[PDB]
Amino acid sequence: HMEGLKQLKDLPAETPDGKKVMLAANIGTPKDVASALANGAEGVGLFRTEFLYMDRNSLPSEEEQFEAYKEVVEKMGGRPVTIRTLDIGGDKELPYLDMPKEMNPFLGYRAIRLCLDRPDIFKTQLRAILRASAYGNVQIMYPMISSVEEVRKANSILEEVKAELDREGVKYDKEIKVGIMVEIPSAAVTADILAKEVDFFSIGTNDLTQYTLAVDRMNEHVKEYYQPFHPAILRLVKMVIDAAHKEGKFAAMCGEMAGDPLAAVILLGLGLDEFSMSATSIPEIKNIIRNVEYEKAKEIAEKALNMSEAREIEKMMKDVIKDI
Amino acid sequence: HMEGLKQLKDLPAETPDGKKVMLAANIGTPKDVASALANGAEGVGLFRTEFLYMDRNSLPSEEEQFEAYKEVVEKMGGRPVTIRTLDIGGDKELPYLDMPKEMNPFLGYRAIRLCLDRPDIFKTQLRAILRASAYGNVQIMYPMISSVEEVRKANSILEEVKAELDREGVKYDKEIKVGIMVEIPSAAVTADILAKEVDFFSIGTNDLTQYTLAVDRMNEHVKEYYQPFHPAILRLVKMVIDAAHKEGKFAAMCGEMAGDPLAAVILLGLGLDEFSMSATSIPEIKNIIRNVEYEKAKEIAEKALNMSEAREIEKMMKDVIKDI
Ligand SMILES: [Mg+2]
Ligand SMILES: [Mg+2]
Secondary structure, X not given: OOOOHHHXXXXXXXXXXXXXXXXXXXXXXXXXXXXXXXXXXOOEEEEEOHHHOOOOOXXXXXXXXXXXXXXXXXXXXXXOEEEEOOOOOOOOOOOOOOOOOOOOHHHOOOOHHHHHHOHHHHHHHHHHHHHHHHHOOEEEEEOOOOOHHHHHHHHHHHHHHHHHHHHHOOOOOOOOEXXXXXXXXXXXXXXXXXXXXXXXXXXXXXXXXXHHHOOOOOOHHHHHHOOOOOHHHHHHHHHHHHHHHHOOOEXXXXXXHHHOHHHHHHHHHHOOOEEEEOHHHHHHHHHHHHOOOHHHHHHHHXXXXXXXXXXXXXXXXXXXXXXX | OOOOHHHHOOXXXXXXXXXXXXXXXXXXXXXXXXXXXXXXXXXXXXXEOHHHOOOOOOOOOHHHHHXXXXXXXXXXXXXXXXXXXXXXXXXXXXXXXXXXXXXXXXXOOOOHHHHHHOHHHHHHHHHHHHHHHHHOOEEEEEOOOOOHHHHHHHHHHHHHHHHHHHHHOOOOOOOOEEEEEEOOHHHHHOHHHHHOOOOEEEEOHHHHHHHHHOOOOOOHHHHHHOXXXXXXXXXXXXXXXXXXXXXXXXXXXXXXXXXXXXXXXXXXHHOOOEEEEOHHHHHHHHHHHHOOOHHHHHHHHHHHHOOOOHHHHHHHHHHHHHHO
8 A cells, every 4th residue: 555755745644454643854944844844744853953053153042043943833834843952062063152071972061961051041942942832833852861850950941931931921832842852761761750740752762772772873983883773772662652651641753763664663563653754754654654554563563572683673674664 | 786897707798687698899900809808808799800901012911811810819719700801992091902082982992892893802811711710710791781692792702712722721610600791771671681691790880870871970060960879770770680580690780889888778679699899898888788687678679769869769778877
């Protein structure tokens, strides 16, 4: 039941036996929206906001951020747009920040840790996001979360800015959903604790794999140690999905794995709610979903979770994709 | 029932209700043995071997390594000596190696990854350890293990050198036990898979905490994010201990947590078999073990595993230690 792109665009990612999932786009600039919609994106599962901070000599103003966020939210016309707060560290050059030199920047002062130490930066971004939420379906997502304590600290600043907007008579979505990236292993291991205090999870498998295997995903000398289908990763993914569902929340994935045809059936079978990916990956994943029964996918996921080697998992999924 | 050092030395680390655990020493040079024995060490749970590789212009010969290993094994007189294979990376200067410059050395080309890419170095060390095993109770431990595949690769080289020694008519302990450091999160998450193919685990909580929380344990700017009592760490520790026990293997811990009085009762209650620590920490931990019932410790561990914040866990353990 494979379909062509033109036919697929308006079709749902639904199994022949009625299991529906959401396919969304990852974007890094408002310019990416056109392609996302052209590929049938049902939302933006990850709006990377670093573009507003790069290649400039001062912080992006609240207004500039707001205009950027609003544009995307408007164009998505009601579809949910999940905006990830600043996720940057000392490995990038930002003339206006003054970041410490670090031996291991990926394990250092970055992302939510930077924002909590620089609430001036954080409040500005949160204000712009909140203001944009008046014009569509907006969700907030915190990156590099290691603990529920950090979520509470971040939410405290969020509530602070909400109160500011209230006093200023500025509109925002009072029901705005707030979730976290799951990419630090501790967040996956304690997803049950976090699930009680976040509206949703989005699994960042790029860095989850990096941290869980202790392998820099950019380091050529150990590239063979970077293994997304390592059983540990599948187990952590399952843990996050189950944890969200136990509390009646949703689990998304915006790591590259979500756009991987080899992973599609496993993710479907594990009960992943939302796949977020490069726009042009959407039709391919949709075709797979539409051509595999949910019950079959669950059997396949179960089989994958019982294997011991990434290699045999990949071999199995190669065959599955072959059969359709 | 607190005892003085002189009385404690020969006493076992045994709860009033009969639960015995092993207290062992971490050492970094043969010179450390005297202090280990003086403090009642029942073995060496971690022999860090980097001393043989540091501050020199060529690799340590098989003979030099052998003499060092033999000395320690002899002096320990029958007590088990767990020797950790080379655990070093590019962050250290070794004139004779030529290591790549890396953005994140802690996630890079180091330890077992170096040894697998440089089997000449690995074989020499394994030969020296094997040869030393003819003279006492020796165990081998691989560091920075992320997957069972790596254990199999390492063991292949071990069996290769064993076969060499056989041909040369050189003695070694045919029953030598071979285990792994659990410090990469994936190793803890898949401890059930690893447990079938290792003789024992030793939990390296120093780096397990670093990788699990994605926090460089040497980076001052994020030091507050390094939290050994984060529930994720306790859960991973429990997972490793239970996994070993399900396969009838032993679980040790050589991370600093094992020498932490605050952790003692939790570790005891979780069923940790072996605590390895700086020698002078042994009597303090022994006193605690001897003054808390196993059944009580299990209740306390269970209580700790049900908490959500490292802070409340630490507060609870402060009180426990206060009461004795
Ligand atoms: Mg990431
Ligand atoms: Mg270590």
